[PDB]
Amino acid sequence: HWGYGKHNGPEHWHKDFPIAKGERQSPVDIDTHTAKYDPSLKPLSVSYDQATSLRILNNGAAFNVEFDDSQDKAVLKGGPLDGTYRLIQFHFHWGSLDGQGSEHTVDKKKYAAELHLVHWNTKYGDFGKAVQQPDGLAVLGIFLKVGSAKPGLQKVVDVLDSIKTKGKSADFTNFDPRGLLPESLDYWTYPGSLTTPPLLECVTWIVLKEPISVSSEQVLKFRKLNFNGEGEPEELMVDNWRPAQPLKNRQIKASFK
């Protein structure tokens, strides 16, 4: 099955998921000088004060921190969005080295990692219905660079030992995702897709201009995770990123000048 190895990586995904060669695939390179400032874009509204985190799961592709999305407790609104989008989970993509790991790139620059806060449009009732709609999901993407530690990430880093292998989970209550945001919510936005199979073209991407800084030790700990299940040969969970895909007939809009 699909993965991030030589034999099942992104270049192979189209054989099982032909939408991999679709018209609105993600990620993309954000060419900052081709993007256009759109003064009609509103400030993002990130309302996470009442967020209820539940669990952290190694799903074999990344680790997901999952939230209670049965009510409007942690929501994204505004920006390019029409309506209310509920946070369901966040996860990261990262590299084997600090110079790669992000899915989106900025003028071809790759960051060490990229955080995805995944939200679904409440008018569609459930996430499964939402992924079948062109405006079903809103994903807030945040780049990670290596420098000073991110204090609000350390609770995540410290629990990874307990979910080393695929299928493992652990309680992860009372986590505040506001601690993973940069200072500025300036962003780029474009229509795209899930970046893992089934690669559905259901996402409004909102990628923050300002990276967060994490320490070398924090991202090092991501790299100790395993793609494999317990009892199987150890395959480090590194380079779990899809490379940039062609922009095709899309425009990237900037919320800032």
Ligand SMILES: [Zn+2]
């Ligand atoms: Zn992702």
